[PDB]
Amino acid sequence: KFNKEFSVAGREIITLPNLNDPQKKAFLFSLWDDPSQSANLLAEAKKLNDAQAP
Amino acid sequence: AVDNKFNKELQNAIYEIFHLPNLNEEQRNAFFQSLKDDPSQSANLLAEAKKLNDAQAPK
């Protein structure tokens, strides 16, 4: 399940500018644990990123 | 027994491997699969990844 789509989703997580390292690590773990949840996880991470906007 | 969600060593290894600058995508993904196959190998696989990263330095 670790293919090109996985790489894209992981990059999307780590480039969210307002998440901190523990948060990105946690999202990346969740993606690794279930790559089929990428859409839900990416939407969750973006929502949290926006909640943390300066 | 350490469950994956409760395993900081596995989670840190995934995060560090994803950041390594000199691996290719195939290497990264192979490490992620090897971690899935046996999370007790996190320390060994992270060390192997850093070794390959350093061997593959562009200068």
Numbering used by the authors:
A (entry chain B): 4 to 57
B (entry chain A): 0 to 58
What text does the study give?
We adopted the Z domain of staphylococcal protein A and its affibody binder dimer complex as a model system. We next generated libraries at the interface of a weakly associating dimer (Z+ ZSPA-1) with micromolar affinity to determine if we could affinity-mature the interface by coevolution. To clarify these inter-residue co-variations discovered from the sequence data, we determined crystal structures of 10 coevolved pairs that spanned a range of cross-reactivities and orthogonalities (5 from LL1 and 5 from LL2). From the structures, we could verify clear compensatory changes between the residues showing the most significant covariations (13A-9B / 17A-31B) in both LL1 and LL2 library mutants.
The highest affinity mutant from each library achieved approximately three-log enhanced affinity, KD of 1.99 nM for LL1.c1 (LIFFK/FILF) and 1.86 nM for LL2.c3 (LVLF/FIIV) compared to the original dimer (KD = 2.92 μM). First, the binding preferences of the two highest affinity pairs from the LL1 library, LL1.c1 (LIFFK/FILF) and LL1.c2 (LILFK/FIVM), are nearly completely orthogonal, so we focused on investigating specificity-determining positions of the two variants. The two mutants differ by only three amino acid positions (positions 17A, 31B, and 32B) but have virtually no cross-reactivity with each other. Z-A sequences of LL1.c1 and LL1.c2 bind to their own Z-B sequence 500-fold stronger than when mixed with the other’s Z-B sequence. Due to the rotation of Trp35B and Trp35B-centered hydrophobic packing induced by Phe32B, the N-terminal end of helix 1 and C-terminal end of helix 2 of Z-A tilted 17° closer to Z-B. Furthermore, the compensatory relationship between position 17A and position 31B is clearly revealed from the structures of LL1.c1 and LL1.c2. Taken together, the synergistic effects of the geometric change and compensatory mutations found from these three specificity-determining positions resulted in biased specificities of the two high-affinity variants evolved from the same library. We also followed a single mutational three-step evolutionary trajectory from LILFK/FIVM to LIFFK/FILF which are the two high affinity orthogonal pairs from LL1 library showing similar thermodynamic trends. A dramatic thermodynamic transition occurs when Leu17A was mutated to Phe, to produce a less favorable binding enthalpy compensated by a more neutral entropy in specific mutant (LIFFK/FILF). The common mutation in both mutants, Leu17APhe, may act as a new anchor residue, thus leading to more entropically favored interactions between two proteins. For example, A-LILFK has more Z-B binding partners (B=77) than A-LIFFK (B=15) from the LL1 library, and A-LVLF (B=53) and A-VFLV (B=42) are also more cross-reactive than A-IVFF (B=3) from LL2 library sequence data.
